[PDB]
């Protein structure tokens, strides 16, 4: 299965309580593939809240992804953590499950060197008949890794491509050029023209759960040549992107969700509650940029 | 229970394959309560590479302590996680196992905000019917809080100190000063005189579960103002721990355990295991320090 | 004088002593107007080792490069100083002397705040009949300016653009956006396309002294939407970009210039002399890209 | 001559112009000298905004604060400076002068490697006849070195100390036990207690020019052993620099001068003018502490 394309980082649906509502998480899934309309779905990532959660709850986020998506469009389930126990779990997990390819961010909290990071991948990629992506976000973890250091690791044939989630377009252009033969997947959505320019396979963005057809268009009207246009389609979205950040990101996705009857929900404590504040101004968004 | 003393943050013993050797783990108690003379055990922190295990794995761990120990030294647990459902399931379990004190890392990862922090810290605590110690770490975490920021913290009387795990001498001067009624307690050991010197109530550190009787002489010593020779044990307990970092932290302590019949074990992978040099090395630091 | 274009951020000639290199340094002027063809020097930037000088150094070197240039292409002089009266003498010095407009880095060493930073430059540019340009550059001075900041400096119309020497692709989109009507420099080299596909009027960098014609490529190529090809150029430019880095900045290019006959001569101390492998290395990569 | 003590950052008073007012500087000296009883004064520090000011007006104050001083109290002159020749030729001048003693921050700015910071104090020290100590403070700098690169450094017996402006106490402590022949300074003067039970040789401090008392009674207490009274007098001059930083720090140590018939006057832009807030702060933090 091709991975090119445009991901929605899956948002998860929660209730007040912190439990996961399986109806809205469906709801979820479905709007991002009828209304969005991405190519797939990556699971078990930032966006999803993944790390605030048990790994039962996990699996079963996993499960209920798979069984709503069915072979739809793709999906890639991301399954690094700390315990690279839980992540060789949720590796073969998931590929049993039939997801495409999986994911794993670079193992963090304590400090590992390069060697230990790169038997931390292999462990999880030699584990399962599967592919995996990369997962680099260095302004969460801390890890940023050279250009050779991404040879290494890209060594493994099982190990197709990365996730980009960095500000560094002169490390992204090394990586295209370097290696040519591997996907990389833009991870800043607001960066999206810029990121495309320089060549990537595709974009996985948070925002792309209700801006996912903008998403596209800057995407594509790019890789067409339409820069003025593309530039243009990439400033309403950083408008929207803006007020976003600026209401809450996660609160205020899912409070747009809602607006347009998805029971996206809340945000796992200690995520802070939408507030009526939050609430009127994420009414507000929906208006102007919807 | 008066939490005042010298804590060492408990190391985990693991065999070949990563999982929990309980026999191994009892030892090092013992070492620590019979060897070590340490008033306390920081059970669930950083050492004992407890954010690379499961939940269950951590339970476990939590009881074999109370277990071994039942009476004879303070417990206090670290339950903290992004988790927070997990958190204050861990909370519960070992207040019912009857830990003298908890204490929470400030939630990582994601970036919250002060508002959220303090609801964090607050959900916790006010879960169980014990007291919680902030674990502020801010080398791991990236998480500074300012003077007034703890001010609000400590707003819970049920939230009696802190692990101040900084080298910021200014702050720690302005907490030992605004903050008389609450435990503070130094988390650098090679900064373990110049801390005690601004009054912190003990310390909780690693080097601790081989080195606790230099530890315990630092701090005696500095109480009675013995500084030049509290300076002299310094001196050869930075000696120490320069070379510990030098060679692996974390495979060093256990291995200079090892030495002593204690079965400390390995690390948990990622975390690379000992290599010939390493091994030979930390035989070479044994006999120029024990 | 409308500003926009490739500008050569001016590497100065030194000889082994230190002395300013005359000979070399119109040289080096000549090279870049007659073969690099560039729309304008960018003279007394961190690359013209500016800040290791004295006053009368920067003036000698002003007027050199005014009177060599003659009025062949665009003048812009960096003034800023730590020492605002220095900044300010150099301001006029340059106007006087009719350099098309000044720039000036961020006051640095000191910790300023934005009220002060904001009297640094109304400061400089309400001195002298000409027009100002802000030179940011986060990385050597440590210093973040937010887009709400930049609105108020803009607010003085004689402050008609910013020299962007940041990596962050967001704040450069909202900056295009937002003003319309000021001009933006890339000072990244080797992110020049996706910096124009986002809308920069031009770059100012340090390897146009060699690679001008590359440059301009890059920039034409993507403002005409030939993308593929401008990413070609980029790819080139930045093998030869990542060599040089890797063999010494400034010591390199100056050595490649010395190549075609241009005495570039040495840097100022402390920055160290070319060592012998340094000199074979740049004779290999001027072979290679030129 | 011992250069051992305590040592004040001398403040320089200036007009509303700018302008360095010399009657004002003298009073400044005198009051450091009388008031103060300080053992010294460090000239041309960064609290004598030394980086806002030209060659000649540096020289101005070395020669007014050796005119003023004489022979009764200790001189180390600051000569630092990203400009080699600028530093070398203040070396000359105020060892000429008859300076005790020279010091030098670490080049900033530029990106020096360590054998090129190294070759910028064997420079500046070789060039005169006497004695240099090394200027760390990586807070404005971003200079970080290690234990055995300040071990290459004191390989010159005419380097005969460092200047520790930074929180790490680990490195201070290594620093004392490892070079127990070099003077080292302790920095910061909110955390005097903490440092000098480390072994220190003295300070240097800009509070001290008003604070000078305190400030003794803290390091004497401390190196008579006298823990608890020493914190006592850190606790209410930690309330005083709290105060102060919090007010503005360089205006208000002058304006608490002023309070006393010391015309301390302005600083120098773009640092801000006091606000009428600000100079009422400043008489309450007089009555407050003296």
Same mark, same amino acid.
């Given at each position: 299965?091709?991975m090119?394309? !445009?991901?929605? +980082? #899956?948002?998860?649906?929660?209730?007040?309580? %912190?439990?996961? &509502?399986?109806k809205? #998480?469906?709801?979820?899934?479905?709007?991002?593939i $009828?209304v969005?309309?991405?190519?797939? #779905?990556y699971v078990?990532?930032?966006?999803?809240?993944?790390?605030?959660?048990?790994?039962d709850?996990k /699996?079963?986020?996993?499960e209920?992804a798979?069984?709503?998506? /069915?072979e739809?469009?793709?999906?890639?389930?991301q399954v690094?953590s700390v315990?690279?126990?839980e992540?060789?779990?949720?590796?073969?997990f998931?590929?049993?499950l %039939?997801?495409?390819?999986?994911?794993?961010?670079?193992?963090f909290?304590?400090?590992?060197?390069?060697?230990?990071?790169?038997?931390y991948?292999?462990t999880?990629? *030699?584990?399962?008949d599967?592919?995996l @992506? @990369?997962?680099? !976000?260095?302004?969460?973890?801390?890890? $940023?890794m050279?250009?050779?250091?991404? %040879?290494?690791?890209?060594? *493994?044939?099982?190990i197709?491509?990365?996730?980009?989630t960095?500000?560094?377009?002169?490390?992204?252009?090394?990586?295209?050029?370097?290696?040519? &033969?591997?996907?990389?997947?833009?991870?800043?959505d607001?960066?999206? #023209?810029?990121?495309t320019?320089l060549g990537?396979?595709?974009?996985?963005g948070?925002?792309? &759960?209700?801006?996912?057809?903008?998403?596209?268009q800057?995407?594509?009207?790019?890789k067409?040549? /339409?820069?003025?246009?593309?530039?243009?389609?990439?400033?309403?979205? *950083?408008?929207?992107?803006?007020?976003?950040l %600026?209401?809450?990101?996660?609160?205020? @996705?899912?409070?747009?969700?809602?607006?347009?009857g998805?029971?996206?929900?809340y945000?796992?404590?200690?995520?802070?509650?939408?507030?009526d504040?939050?609430?009127?101004? +994420?009414?507000?968004?929906?208006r102007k940029?919807?």
């Open positions: 299965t091709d090119k394309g !445009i991901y929605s +980082a #899956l948002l998860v649906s929660f209730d007040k309580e %912190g439990n996961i &509502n399986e809205g #998480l469906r709801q979820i899934i479905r709007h991002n $009828d969005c309309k991405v190519d797939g #779905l078990g990532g930032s966006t999803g809240e993944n790390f605030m959660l048990s790994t709850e /699996k079963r986020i996993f209920i798979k069984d709503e998506v /069915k739809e469009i793709k999906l890639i389930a690094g315990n690279l126990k992540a060789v779990e949720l590796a073969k998931t590929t049993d %039939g997801y495409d390819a999986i994911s794993a961010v670079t193992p909290y304590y400090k590992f060197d390069f060697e230990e990071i790169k038997h991948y292999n999880i990629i *030699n584990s399962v599967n592919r @992506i @990369i997962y680099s !976000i260095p302004f969460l973890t801390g890890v $940023d050279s250009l050779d250091q991404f %040879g290494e690791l890209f060594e *493994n044939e099982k197709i491509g990365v996730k980009f960095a500000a560094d377009f002169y490390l992204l252009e090394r990586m295209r050029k370097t290696f040519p &033969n591997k996907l990389i997947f833009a991870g800043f607001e960066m999206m #023209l810029p990121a320019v990537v396979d595709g974009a996985i948070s925002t792309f &759960n209700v801006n996912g057809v903008r998403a596209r800057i995407f594509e009207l790019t067409n040549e /339409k820069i003025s246009e593309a530039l243009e389609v990439q400033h309403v979205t *950083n408008d929207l992107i803006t007020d976003i %600026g209401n809450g990101l996660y609160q205020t @996705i899912k409070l747009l969700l809602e607006e347009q998805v029971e996206a929900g945000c796992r404590q200690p995520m802070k509650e939408a507030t504040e939050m609430k009127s101004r +994420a009414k507000e968004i929906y940029y919807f």
